[PDB]
């Protein structure tokens, strides 16, 4: 019963490298394969380059990597021929040839000064590339004022720039944009506000005691006002603060709360009473809304003024919220379900040191991570019976009335034959770091007349949308469990899935396919390494003009770009800047895996990780024509 199966990514890409998995189980000896890609519909011959042969040495496992050189999506007809037995199918293509990136040397510009942006080309993988590009510059009204068209070839991915802001030009929020010429529909947006300003010499932090406001906390949301000069020392002055009621995008200014206190020593104290709160507007209604502050510090010398502002403080009686979005939405009947609740303080930030327990099993407990996600589990009975989960937060100091709760649901995993053949992958979910060894647990589930036939599992590793690595693992008859030692490199960062499965023919002439996916977030780090420090081994504050050697440590052969910035520009405006953390935060939003947690059936687990399965006896995965993942249905 030689049968020929085959896999790939769920949504392909362009001018990029996607892999794919040949196979020949129960095959005899050799088998010359020839792979190909024809545009759809018809025949144009786009990439037929690949060839391979499945030794009985690579366990009947062959492997190949390629480079694929309206308003409706276009597709790619892909073909594989195993000696004579040919199998083919179609997969959705995405116009995106990678990502594009911006950094404005200043966050706010005086009309007349120059702007120094710089952009960085890369692919679906984080390496340098040389293509071609378009770069405009729009005013706050939406009109391209100047554009360019250079290419990052033999430039090493990095690009130089300079545009002068005319004396007369509109003030507000300008917007610079870019996009690969190959793909004119995928464009990127970065901004710099033009305004007539003078740099302040200090900074102002607005810090309420509470993250959020309890509705029945008479005392009210208090707030500490701490002013400090740019260079560290403590600012002396008097300030002006004002509060308000936001309701989505609308802001209810409260002129009955406008205070003034003595910023002494770079620390002043302002409170707002719960009565100046009720008469700016019942109170089971203001729940859901958030508030916002507006400080304004003017020194006792009358030279400078700074304007600080906090926004999005929630009036939640139930401090912690309970998210089920790192959580799988399916299970496997008769085996453990790992629970990755996502607790948040009211603003959006994750909770800490807050026990949570199952609805039943009062004994069961979890402990908070520095991240707002703990570790829980429970045995599932051998039922295809949907699992109704009512998590309850159990942190003391509060009541079973102030404790927020959230109910999600996990669904069965449908096995072909349904004869009763499951696979369950158990993993030491740890805050994995580059250089660690992570175990991989295989819990088979079958009667003992067809377990003398499963001699190898097969698997894969997702990563930002591409396929990272593959091969096989060995299982001997009588071992319903084999561990798989895997070492972590810098690449799986940020998050990476993993899919596994076997093939056998059992029951009554029925080749069977059972599988199981899985998703883990590995520590978010720039993959190589880089730091900037002060060269001198002894640091004393250099006076204006002096020489200080500046040491630096990075990867060899790497190019490096550098720029300094006065901390007096980030006291009128410190947004639109660049965070590596805003870097990965975007390379995840562009994943093809969507329900990392689980799978409905052996095919669902594939589209629910970013993969299309197909074979030579009928079984195959869902045809994904949906670029943007399943628009989250709350």
């Amino acid at each position: 019963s030689p049968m020929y199966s085959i896999i790939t990514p769920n949504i392909l890409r362009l001018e990029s490298e996607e892999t794919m998995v040949l196979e020949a189980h129960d095959a005899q000896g050799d088998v010359p394969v020839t792979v190909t890609v024809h545009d759809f519909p018809g025949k144009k011959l786009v990439l037929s380059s690949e060839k391979t042969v499945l030794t009985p040495a690579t366990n009947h496992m062959g492997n190949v990597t390629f480079t694929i050189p309206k308003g409706r999506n276009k597709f790619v007809t892909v073909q594989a021929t195993f000696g004579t037995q040919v199998v083919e199918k179609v997969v959705l293509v995405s116009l995106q040839s990678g990502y594009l990136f911006i950094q404005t040397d200043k966050t706010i510009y005086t009309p007349g000064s120059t702007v120094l942006y710089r952009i960085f080309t890369v692919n679906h993988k984080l390496l340098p590339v040389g293509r071609t590009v378009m770069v405009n510059i729009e005013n706050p009204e939406g009109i391209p004022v100047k554009q360019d068209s250079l290419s990052s070839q033999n430039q090493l991915g990095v690009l130089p720039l300079s545009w002068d802001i005319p004396e007369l030009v509109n003030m507000g929020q300008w917007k610079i944009r870019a996009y690969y010429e190959n793909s004119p529909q995928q464009v990127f947006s970065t901004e710099f506000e033009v305004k007539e300003y003078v740099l302040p010499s200090f900074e102002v932090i607005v810090e309420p005691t509470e993250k959020f406001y309890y509705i029945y906390n008479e005392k009210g949301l208090e707030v500490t006002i701490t002013a400090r000069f740019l260079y560290g020392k403590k600012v002396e002055g008097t300030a002006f603060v004002i509060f308000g009621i936001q309701d989505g995008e609308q802001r209810i200014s409260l002129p009955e709360s406008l205070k003034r206190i003595p910023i002494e020593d770079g620390s002043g104290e302002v409170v707002l009473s719960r009565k100046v709160l009720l008469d700016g507007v019942r109170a089971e209604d203001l729940v859901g809304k958030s508030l916002y502050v507006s400080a304004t510090v003017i020194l006792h010398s009358g030279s400078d003024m700074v304007q600080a502002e906090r926004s999005g403080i929630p009036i939640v009686t139930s401090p912690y919220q309970i998210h089920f979005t790192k959580t799988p939405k399916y299970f496997k009947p008769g085996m453990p379900f790992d629970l990755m609740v996502f607790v948040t303080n009211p603003d959006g930030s994750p909770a800490y040191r807050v026990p949570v327990a199952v609805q039943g099993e009062d004994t069961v407990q979890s402990l908070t991570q520095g991240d707002g996600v703990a570790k829980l589990s429970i045995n599932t009975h051998p039922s295809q019976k949907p699992l109704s989960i009512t998590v309850r937060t159990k942190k003391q100091e509060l009541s079973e009335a102030e404790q927020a709760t959230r109910t999600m649901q996990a669904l069965p995993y449908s096995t072909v034959g349904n004869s009763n053949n499951y696979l369950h992958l158990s993993v030491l979910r740890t805050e994995l770091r580059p250089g660690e060894t992570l175990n991989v647990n295989f819990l088979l589930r079958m009667d003992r007349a067809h377990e003398a036939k499963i001699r190898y599992y097969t698997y894969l590793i997702m990563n930002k949308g591409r396929l990272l690595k593959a091969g096989r693992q060995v299982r001997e008859p009588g071992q319903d469990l084999v561990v798989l030692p895997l070492s972590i490199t810098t690449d799986f960062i940020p998050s990476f899935r993993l899919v596994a499965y076997y093939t056998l023919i059992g029951a009554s002439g029925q080749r069977e396919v059972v599988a199981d996916s899985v998703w883990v977030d590995v520590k978010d780090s720039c993959v190589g390494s880089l730091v900037v420090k002060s060269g001198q081994s002894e640091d004393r504050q250099p006076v204006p003009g002096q020489q200080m050697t500046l040491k630096i440590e990075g990867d060899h052969g790497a190019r490096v770009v550098l720029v300094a910035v006065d901390k007096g520009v980030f006291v009128l405006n410190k947004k639109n800047k660049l965070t590596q953390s805003k870097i990965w935060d975007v390379v995840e939003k562009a994943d093809i895996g969507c329900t990392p947690g689980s799978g409905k059936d052996y095919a669902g687990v594939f589209s629910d990780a970013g993969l299309t399965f197909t074979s030579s006896s009928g079984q195959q995965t869902a045809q994904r024509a949906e670029l943007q993942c399943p628009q989250p249905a709350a």
């Binding site: 984080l126 010499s201 030279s303 300094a564």
Partner: protein
């Protein structure tokens, strides 16, 4: 120099106002150990005294990208100056700069010496010989302020510079920040014209032109530029496209090629047809992207069972059918983009219809009818079976035409042939079905002209269908062959409705009697997407010409980059013409931008009287209907005054006012910029207060203080008033004529006690001495703000910076209070000399100023030196002349 301090002569000034610097690019050249490279750079820290924050990005070809997020190098010193200059200040207006002297000494308060230097761009309390310096005492770990008044007399990037040095301690640091002194003005962008372009619809001629007037800007402040921008916007529309059929309940079309030639085609005819369609409609997704390869094998599947009856040219037993061989070229010349077809089994059954089944007139005969006789469709009507049979084989060989234009000699003659018999007999047709079958047998050649064109447009009953009495599957096939032309023709005002009838029949195909009813209700609906204009248009190509263009101007708004805004601009004022051309619609908008009560809703009135301790009084009213919210009262004293520590707490206790407990500290010595927070400024009336100020510091020439009124929500709508005990409102006493300003803060410049030959040679060879002339006053004008004297130089004793020949007239200027200085009468000679700092205006149009250093002496006439009383002066002046022209100064 020898004081316990640092003169202004070494205090290098902190001019690093700018935020961006050190934007360098450096690679990892050094050899690396363990994949880690070390670079050392020696940077020169900018002058700004704050805390520079870093930020860098590493791109390694191996190690993708990293963020070596920046740390922090704090830059501080023991004593510096935070020169706080605005982004700009208007010319001719008096303002108030702030300059904070931060002393972060442990517990050593600094005895400072802060001195504003002169700048001939700023009429301040510091002139060319006078210094405006003071002596303050900043307590330890504190911020102390110091007000400085000025009047920017010149536009353009000007210069301000404060340097301070402590007594007894040897610290020193200035800050040279520069401010953009702009001419007063209002940011405006008048619209020049807002019109539409389209040489198709507008002008009614090609090359539609559009003349354009220059911007009037009647009210443009002099010496200021102004730009104009232009916009190029394509505004295309899309319409007249209808939806193909959902193919959704059309899941019976792919039944497998099986049987004898004729049964091998009743059931493969719906096959290929579903394929050609869902190809050019993009329905493949919701149907099954996958059943397509369960169908491209039931097309080439019959291709080798159908290649199993092709006698030498149905049954192979039976005589070849002229109907199954001219439909063997209709199911093949379309399944050529789908499967492997032989240009020998296609180009070897079309040289058989021209050479075997063609009469001398191009009419086609039927020898052996086809055994299945319902599949022939609508020819089955023996009615005109050489007008529905001469029009059917006529479309099976105009279809195979490009494939093999070289494999058949016999084509070029058979094509015109058939078509000459038909066009003649085209006026001789009844059946709406033979009018549409010949109709499209013809319209692929360009001959349906005249009478054959209008008889084919009326045959459509209701004009959307070509129908005959009786069978319906011969009306759909008539409506199809009818739309076939409609589009082969490039007309689409009669296609819209014809396509709303065919999918109103929800004809999902198949059936018995429908092997032609299926092949046409689709290929027609299948070809309607490749023609669809989609209303895509716009080949605009406009030409620009402008009084600045030495070069030609050209862009083009093609459909692919049509919404790409193609804009152009300049800095100069012109007239010009535009010249549009080509299809497509767009819109044109153009806009120039140029330069067209300080109180804005805040009254202020600041008063100063004696009680040498004085008493101040301020008046503020809000020009609102609502009593304005929390407002503020900024106050910087005059040099030598601290508030009476007993009236800063009589207004701090009263409600509606406040004095942060931070203003009771420091006491009487350190308090020269106050902050009295107000809780409301009524709109009804002025709300007035007042306190006391003693005289603790004694000094000459005190400083016009101030009082600033603004709400907290807008630092912008404020009203600042000044107050001096001497001039009326705080404004120093100056002489203005028009645009020009000067510092008349001086005394009445003016008994011949002594004047000898030596007394002159010394004062005429001094440093400032620049010009020396013997002029004769010609004209004497006098204004209400100052006088002037147009004197002509009769000789240049000493040429200065001003290049002036003997005879020309140089204008002299003097205050109106100097009319008693020297009554410069007309037609009298005078010996004069001054400094170069007295020049006024700009070469060659300069103007002299009779200042304190301008020597004015009366020169006796020719017949006046005869007087025995003017001789002593005539000899001195005469000798002084020769002692200068040839000799010179003794230094």
């Amino acid at each position: 120099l020898d004081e316990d301090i640092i003169a202004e002569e070494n205090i290098v000034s902190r001019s690093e106002f700018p935020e961006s610097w050190l934007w360098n690019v450096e690679d990892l050249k050094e050899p690396p150990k363990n994949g880690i490279s070390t670079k050392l750079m020696n940077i020169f820290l900018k002058d700004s005294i704050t805390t520079w924050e870093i930020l860098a990005v590493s791109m390694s070809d191996k190690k993708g990208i990293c963020v070596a997020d920046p740390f922090e190098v704090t830059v501080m010193q023991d004593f510096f100056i935070d020169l706080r200059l605005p982004y700009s200040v208007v010319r001719n207006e008096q303002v108030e700069i702030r300059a904070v002297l931060y002393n972060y000494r442990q517990n050593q308060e600094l005895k400072v010496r802060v001195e504003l230097l002169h700048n001939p761009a700023f009429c301040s309390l510091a002139t060319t010989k006078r210094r405006h310096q003071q002596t303050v005492t900043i307590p330890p770990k504190s911020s102390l302020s110091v007000p400085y008044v000025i009047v920017p007399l010149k536009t353009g990037l000007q210069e301000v510079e404060v340097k301070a040095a402590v007594y007894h301690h040897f610290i020193s640091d200035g800050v040279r920040k520069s401010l953009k002194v702009v001419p007063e003005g209002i940011r405006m962008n008048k619209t020049v014209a807002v019109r539409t372009l389209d040489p198709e619809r507008l002008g009614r001629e090609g090359v539609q032109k559009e003349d354009i007037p220059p911007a009037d800007l009647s009210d443009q402040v002099p010496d200021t530029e102004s730009e104009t921008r232009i916009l190029l916007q394509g505004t295309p529309v899309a319409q007249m496209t209808e939806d193909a059929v959902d193919a959704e309940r059309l899941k019976h079309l792919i039944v497998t090629p099986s049987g004898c030639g004729e049964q091998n085609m009743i059931g493969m005819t719906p096959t290929v047809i579903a394929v050609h369609y869902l190809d050019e409609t993009e329905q493949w997704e919701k149907f099954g992207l996958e059943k397509r390869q369960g169908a491209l094998e039931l097309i080439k599947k019959g291709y080798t069972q159908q290649l199993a009856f092709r006698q030498p040219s149905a049954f192979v037993k039976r005589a070849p059918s002229t109907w199954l061989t001219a439909y063997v070229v209709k199911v093949f010349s379309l399944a050529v983009n789908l499967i492997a077809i032989d240009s020998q089994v296609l180009c070897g059954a079309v040289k058989w219809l021209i050479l075997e089944k063609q009469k001398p007139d191009g009419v086609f005969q039927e020898d052996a009818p086809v055994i299945h006789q319902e599949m022939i469709g609508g020819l089955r009507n023996n009615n005109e079976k050489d007008m529905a049979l001469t029009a059917f084989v006529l479309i099976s060989l105009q279809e195979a035409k490009d494939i093999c234009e070289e494999q058949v000699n016999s084509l070029p003659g058979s094509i015109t042939k058939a078509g000459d018999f038909l066009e003649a007999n085209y006026m001789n047709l009844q059946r709406s079905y033979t009018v549409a079958i010949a109709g499209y047998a013809l319209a692929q050649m360009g001959r349906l002209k005249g009478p054959l064109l209008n008889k084919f447009l009326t045959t459509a009953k209701d004009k959307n269908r070509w129908e005959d009495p009786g069978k319906q599957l011969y009306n759909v096939e008539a409506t199809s062959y009818a739309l076939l032309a409609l589009l082969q023709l490039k007309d689409f005002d009669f296609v819209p409705p014809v396509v709303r009838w065919l999918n109103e029949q929800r004809y999902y195909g198949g059936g018995y009697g429908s092997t032609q009813a299926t092949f046409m209700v689709f290929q027609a609906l299948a070809q309607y997407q490749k023609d669809a204009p989609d209303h895509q248009e716009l080949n605009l190509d406009v030409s620009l010409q402008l009084p600045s263009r030495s070069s030609k101007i050209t862009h083009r708004i093609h459909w692919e980059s049509a919404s790409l805004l193609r804009s152009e601009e300049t800095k100069e004022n012109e007239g010009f013409t535009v010249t549009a051309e080509g299809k497509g619609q767009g819109t044109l908008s153009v806009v120039t931008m140029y330069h067209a009560l300080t109180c804005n809703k805040f009254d202020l009135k600041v008063t100063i009287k004696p009680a040498n301790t004085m008493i101040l009084e301020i008046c503020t009213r809000y020009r609102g209907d609502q009593d304005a919210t929390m407002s503020i009262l900024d106050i910087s004293m005059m040099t030598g005054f601290a508030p009476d520590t007993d009236d800063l707490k009589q207004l701090a206790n009263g409600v509606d006012r406040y004095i942060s407990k931070y203003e009771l500290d420091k006491a009487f010595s350190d308090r020269n910029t106050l902050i009295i927070y107000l809780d409301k400024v009524s709109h009804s009336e002025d709300d007035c207060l007042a306190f006391k100020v003693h005289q603790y510091f004694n000094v000459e020439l005190i400083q016009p203080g101030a009082v600033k009124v603004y709400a907290y929500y807008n630092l912008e709508e404020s009203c600042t008033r000044f107050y001096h005990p001497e001039k009326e409102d705080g404004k120093l006493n100056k002489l203005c004529r028009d645009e020009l300003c000067r510092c008349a803060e001086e005394n009445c410049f003016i008994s011949d006690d002594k004047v000898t030959l030596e007394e002159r040679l010394d004062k005429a060879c001094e440093p400032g001495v620049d010009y020396v002339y013997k002029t004769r006053l010609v004209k004497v004008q006098l204004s209400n703000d100052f006088d002037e004297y147009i004197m002509a130089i009769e000789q240049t004793i000493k040429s200065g910076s001003d290049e002036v020949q003997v005879g020309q007239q140089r204008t002299f200027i003097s205050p109106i209070k100097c009319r008693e200085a020297l009554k410069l009468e007309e037609k009298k000679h005078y010996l004069m000399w001054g400094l170069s700092s007295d020049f006024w205006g700009e070469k060659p149009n300069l103007s002299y100023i009779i200042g304190k250093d301008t020597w004015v002496e009366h020169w006796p006439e020719e017949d006046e030196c005869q007087d025995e009383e003017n001789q002593k002066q005539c000899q001195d002046l005469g000798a002084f002349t020769e002692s200068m022209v040839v000799f010179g100064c003794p230094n």
